[model samples]
Target: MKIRDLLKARRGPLFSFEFFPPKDPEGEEALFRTLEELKAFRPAFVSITYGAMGSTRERSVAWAQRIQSLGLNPLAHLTVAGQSRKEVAEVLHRFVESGVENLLALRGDPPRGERVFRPHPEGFRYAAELVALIRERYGDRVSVGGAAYPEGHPESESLEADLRHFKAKVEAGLDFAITQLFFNNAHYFGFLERARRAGIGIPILPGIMPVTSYRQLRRFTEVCGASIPGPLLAKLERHQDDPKAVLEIGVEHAVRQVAELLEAGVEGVHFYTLNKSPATRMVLERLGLRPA
Candidate 1:
């Protein structure tokens, strides 16, 4: 079912999160523990992201399947930039064969140390083309999601032009959109308004990541266009010496942000947990959010 339908029965927005496969032995244990803690929120569904070169595919499959086995719908992320269409198709088939019914399609970044993304000579070139292929190959059997950027995508010339690009993908065939996380709700609200005006008909869920540490937060801000609000930044800076207090302040900020998004009538909210759940759970608990 579209998340919009699921969220309608609840008074507030739908709660969901994204997780990645672990890269090491210790990281594996830590991930499942985080999942266990978040299971209580009963998220609409959990998403597993893919890494470049398809390096993390196996681990992602394991976690996606495990989440599905627990009765949660898992959205397996598939990127078509680094591999051939046949290779991507094989991965898609593997997930479908395993009974996974959802995918978040993307033309992802090139592998590490690469300056630009180049589609394999025989592979997908753009997210729109990939979405068309998935719809043709899988039809209604799999629900497909596409990404949205609240601040224009790093490469977009202007916000108006970016919405036109996004509108084309929706026309190709997109089930819904999950945004890249941002610090403020205004960016999201403005993007949603233009998306609607441009004739994109799909649920546009805001992505959120609660701050955990100064270093990690800075890295995310630089990579993604998501900004740090001035007040929140000041608060975190004051507690720079206390990790515990900084985390608490971050959680409070996220909780307040979600409350405002729901009030604005967003269909749902997606959290970028960065593979840790304590801070995410704290925000969910404060907002009184639960799975549908």
Candidate 2:
């Protein structure tokens, strides 16, 4: 199913999850198990992300197909990191032929072990260009998504410029957007306000990741534009020695975050599952968003 149509059909907030490609057979087993576990809850949709380079793009497609075969809609992630336009077109064709109809278009980061991003001579340089290309070639046959950075993209100069960049992609024919993970709700609301003022009206879903480890939290926030507020960091650090306690703090924080977002009538919540069900499952159960 086209995710955009699914989103439109639902009048209330939608709940979705994102997963990454597994690294091995054992990992793949765990990934499928998580999908089966979450399937009972009937998620609005699910997504699989491509790797930093093109190493996992094919893996992403395979996983999306796997999820679909499980009777769930899968949103496949694609990027313009290491392929030419012709290669990208081939990927799109492969996706549609495999019964996949949704995409999360990204201007992928530089390949691993590289510090700067350099676009291929014939490949896209920005996600907006990719969105435009998809719409031009596929029309409404595919529903496309783009990433939004509430704190501003890492490479963006300023928030003003960031809004401009994001709006361009929406104007270029994006169906909806999922924000990059953010710890602070204020930043999300602020970003939403600015995006609305700028005339980007798509339903922008807030991406949430429950912090399972302090080190992982720091690494993710630093790499992305998200920040852990001082008070939240203090609470998380207080339980750093106890892994279970740290996880509880993370789940509790996410529960509160979702409650507030839903109270404010945000479009939806997209959980970055990290290919694990415990933390995300806990949060969903707490909110009664998932079956016990």
Candidate 3:
């Protein structure tokens, strides 16, 4: 189905998940356990993030196929920030060959110290251009998605500018949007308001990460431009010395966020599974979002 129809056909809020590719054999095993645990929830689909520096390209494709074999759709994350169009096309061709229909196209992080994304010698300059090219070549054979940052992209000069870029990508044939995680719902609602005002109507799913470790979450927020809410931070700070308490607080926080997002009329939510299932399942149970 086209991504827009995928969202429209949903009777109510959609539940989705994201998982990272593991680099080692043990890590890979653990991911299978995670998948087995969450399979009962019957997610609409699951996505595998592209490795930042091209380390996990093949693995991402494999896992996408594996997830598809599990009777669920697989949305492969594709980043063209550092590669030429030839390279980009190479990835798309692989995706097409693999029979993976969904994608999340992105202008990935600037390599190491680079200040901005510089298109490769034969690459498209913006993600919009990439989507357009992919549409021209693949047509309905594939569906495309792009990133959304509720608080605005880290490099965007203003929220207005950010929405314009998002709108452009959608107009260029992007099928949906999966957002960066934000702890505060107000920011997401505000972003949606502005997106609608700018004529960008799409299934913009909210990404939610269950924070089990203060340090781990803090480090991630530092890079993603997501701010940990003060209240949640205070709770985590209180249990900093106890692993059990910390995990409990993490699931509680995530459950609350899921409930709030559903209440807020979101089209769907994408959980950042972090390659594990304990915290995600706990939150799902608390929200009564699990299937029998």
Candidate 4:
């Protein structure tokens, strides 16, 4: 089912989850277990992220197909990182033939150890171009999504410039958007206000990741250009050595964020599960959100 239609059909806010391709057998097993556990919550759709530079393209596709086999709608990701136009088209065709119905188009991050994004001579340079390609080639056969940056994309020069770029993606035919994970809700609300004023009206789901580790939190925020609120950072740092304490704090924070977001009437919430279900499960349960 297309996520856009799901959003329209749901009486309440939609809940979704994102996972990455596992690297080994044990990791794969863990991922499958997590999926089985979360299936009871009934995510609107589950997404599998394509690795940087198409490093795990095959695994991503395989996982997306597997998730679909489990009777869950899968939003497979595609990136114009290291592939040519023909290669990108082949992937789209593969998804169509396999019964995958939704996609997340991205320009992808620079390859490991690289500072700037360099597009292949025959590939796209921006996510908007990828979105445009999918719309032109597949039309309504596949629903398409794109990334939104509540704190502005790291590579963007300014918020105004970022808004311009995002508007371009919407113009290119994005059905919905999922924002980069952010700790501060103000960033999301502020971005939402500006996006609406700019006439970029689409379901922009807030991406939330319950902070499981202080180190992981720092690395993610630093790499993604998301800011950590001082109070939250201090609290996490203080309990950084205690695993259970950290989990509690993380789940507590996420519960509060989702609670507030639901109160504000946001369209949906997308949890970056990082291939685990306990923390996300706790957050959803605390808020009394279950498959309805």
Candidate 5:
């Protein structure tokens, strides 16, 4: 089923996960193994990240196909970075033919080691433009989703400007948006309040990342511009030496964060799994959300 329909069904708050296309056959094997473990939870849907400029173009499309074959909903991500309009259309056609119906359109970050985002001469310079192109070409054949940054996009001038751009993506006809991972609930709530006030009505799912590695967590937050609360950072540092202790602390925090979000009745929660299953499984198990 299309993700839009899944969101509308609303039997309960939706659960979803995100993964990136693997780099090699062994990686692919590991990804599916993780998926098999996750599938039992009956995730409402799952997303595969697209590479910069279609770097992993074939692998991304291939993984989405595999995801669907596993009897799971797949949300294909398409970035308007490093690809011409014609190239972008080609990828869309591949998804259409593969029977994948949902996508996350993004103006992805500059490629590795690059300081600025330079749009392809024949490609879109912004996510809103990419979203508009998708809607114009595929119409309802694809349910489009976009990204939200609770702490403001790194390259954005300010929170207000970032929000205006997000609203523009919605106006361009995105069905919904999943946020960049944030450790603070207030950030998500603040973004929600601002979005609603700005007349952006689509469901916005808060993205959560379970901290498996202190180093990895710190690196991610720095790269994405998400801040770890002072207390949380100190707690991680306190247990940094013991890997297991770090994992336990991270899981405990995520469980508490999720419980609060669920109580507040946000549309849903999306997990940025980083292609791992254990942390995500622990979170779902703690929520008492088990497979049928």
Candidate 6:
């Protein structure tokens, strides 16, 4: 089922998980283990992240098909970073043939070692354009989602500008949005308010990631432009050396963040699993969110 329809029919907020394509056979085995563990929660859908510059395009599509084979809905990520218009169309056709019905369109980051994003000579320059192309070609055959940033995209000049860009994607026919991981609930709430006031009404799911490593958390936040609250940062920093303590802190923080979002009536929660399940499992178990 498309996420848009799931959001409408579900009695409770949708619970979803995002996984990245694993690089090796061992990694793939570990990822399937994680998937089996979390499948008990019955995610509304599970998404597979597309690697930058379509580096993992084949793997991403295969994973999406594999997820569907498990009888779970799969939302595949597609980006117009390195592919031309024809290449993008071909990828979409592959998804259609594979029976993957949902997509998260994006203007992917520049390839590694490149600071600036230069669109392919014949590809889209922005996510909105990609979304438009999807709608124009595929129509209602696929449900489309887009990325949003609670703390503003790193490349945007201002929050207002970031929102304008988001609105453009929505206007182009997005069925929903999933925000970047944020440590603070206030940022999500604030972004929601601003988005609503601006007349963009898609169901915006808050992305959550349980921080398992201090170094990894810092690196991710820096790359995505999300801010860690001072107290949370201090707590994590205080226990940075102890892996067990860091995992506890991270899971506890994510549980609190998710609980608060649930209280505020969010449309859904999207867990960025990063190909592991313990931290995410702990948070969901703590919140008593096991789906029947």
Best by lDDT: 6
**Pairs clashing in candidate 3?**
none
Q: What is the TM-score of each predicted model, taking all chains together?
A: 0.93, 0.96, 0.95, 0.98, 0.97, 0.98
Q: Runs in model 1 with CA error above 4 Å?
A: 1-12, 289-292
Better of 1 and 2 by lDDT: 2
- Model 2 lDDT tens row, 1-292: 7878887788788878988999899999998899888877778889888886467778877887788878888888888878887877787778878888888989898766676788877887888888988898889998999999999887887889989999999999999999999887998899999999999899899999998999989889987858898988998888898999999999999999998999999877999989999998899899876573
Query: lDDT order of candidates, best first?
Result: 6, 4, 5, 2, 3, 1
119-209: candidate 1 lDDT, tens digit per residue = 8888887788878988899887778889999898876788888888898888888878899988888988888888888877788889999
lDDT of each: 0.83, 0.87, 0.83, 0.90, 0.90, 0.91
Q: After superposition, how far is residue 92 of candidate 6 from its true place, in Å?
A: 1.0
Residue 263 in candidate 1 has what lDDT?
80
Encode model 6's per-residue lDDT on 1-292: one tens digit a residue. 8888999888998889999998999999999999998888989999999888788899988988898878789999999998898888788789878998899999999877787788999988899988998899889888999999989988898988999989988999999999999998999999999999999988999999999999989999988889999999999999999999999999999999999999988888999999999999999999986735
Question: If both were scored by lDDT, which would come out higher, candidate 2 or candidate 4?
Answer: 4
Q: Report the C-alpha lDDT of model 4 over 11-45, residue by residue, as the tens digit.
A: 88987999999999999999989999888898889
TM-score of the candidate numbered 3? Answer: 0.95
Off by over 4 Å in 5: none
- Per-residue error for 57 in candidate 1, Å, reads 1.2
Q: What is the RMSD, in Å, between candidate 1 and the native fold over all Cα? A: 2.1
RMSD of each: 2.1, 1.4, 1.6, 1.2, 1.0, 1.1
For candidate 4, give the lDDT.
0.90
Clashes of each: 1, 0, 0, 0, 0, 0
Compared with the true structure, model 4 gives a TM-score of 0.98
- The residue pairs that clash in candidate 2, if any, are none
Residue 1 lDDT, candidate 1, scale 0-100: 43
